[model samples]
Target: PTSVEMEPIDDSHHLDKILLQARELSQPIIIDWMASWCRKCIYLKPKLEKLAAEYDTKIKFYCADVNKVPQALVKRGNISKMPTIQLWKDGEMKAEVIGGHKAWLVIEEVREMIQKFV
Candidate 1:
């Protein structure tokens, strides 16, 4: 019942800006970890965008391309899976939804996770 803001964040090696955004908004953020070659990521885009439009006011949805991001940040995020979705809160990771699932299922999962602490 809320809107999620779909924002694109730079994948710099440091997390200073991202952490600052989290502190400023007081809302958890979702980092969509993906690469150009990820078929699942390609498939999930439209569905994710739809969810973002639906929940644009409630949460922050950010996409981070692994290939573009520096290697250090990838390691810091501990991203072992492609097409992974990570939730960040208070400058730390709150939870993660990995792999690509059905569009409807992913939407429900994202919604459920957002509702949990918010």
Candidate 2:
């Protein structure tokens, strides 16, 4: 199947609307947090997109550049590492998958992390 890319969460406004709808629908969403200088995060980008498409039926996936994201939102949720994947349900965040391992392993865990929430 073709890729169904994730929506970008670059600013606070977009983030608010996305989470607002997620809460309204009482649905879950995935957020991929990465830094511009990160190699693994860049490498794992398409995999997340692929996963995004795979789970597009229920989950809305979003990508956030850690370095570029505003401090207002950044302070709300502290990102301690690169490639931190978070699951949000009913506007409340849960199920974090930090990509500290290999990309394949990361993808596997991400899928597993997704399964539990779904």
Candidate 3:
């Protein structure tokens, strides 16, 4: 398959550094927050991977496990749900699509969000 690789972020400081990089690069990034007890969101991640592969180098996708990430970053992200998919540009989160119970529905919403972003 295509290179559908979404990197995982470790901490808050590193993420800020990453944001700085992307801001200067004038590139868009996607932050996919994964929870420890998330179940339905598992089904949606691969769909995101495929979508990531479609865009390829145009977007950088990153996943952060809430259990592993610091609370500071999580709260700064303004997460109120298990898995939150947010698009960041110019060092700011500009768009977000909350995942629902159904995988395809989530994919559809995410696609629309990306379409609008493009």
Which pairs clash in model 3? none
TM-score of each: 0.83, 0.91, 0.90
lDDT, candidates in the order shown: 0.74, 0.82, 0.82
Q: Per-residue alpha-carbon lDDT of model 2 for 5-113, expressed as tens digits? A: 8777968777889989988777899988888799999988888888888876688888888788797766545678989989888666778889966887898998898
Of candidates 2 and 1, the better by lDDT: 2
Considering lDDT, where higher is better, how would the candidates rank from best to worst? 2, 3, 1
Give the better candidate number (2 or 3) by lDDT.
Answer: 2
Find the 10 residues in a row with the least total lDDT in model 1.
1-10
Question: How do the candidates rank by TM-score, highest first?
Answer: 2, 3, 1
Write down the TM-score for model 1.
0.83
Worst 10 residues of 3 by lDDT: 1-10
lDDT of 1 at 115: 78
Name the top lDDT candidate.
2
lDDT of 3 by residue, 1-118 (tens): 4648678887888789889988777888888887767986677788878888888868888888887888888886888886789988887889998885787888788778878875
Off by over 4 Å in 3: 1-3
Candidate 1 residue pairs that clash: 2-55, 3-55, 3-56, 3-57, 3-58, 4-55, 4-56
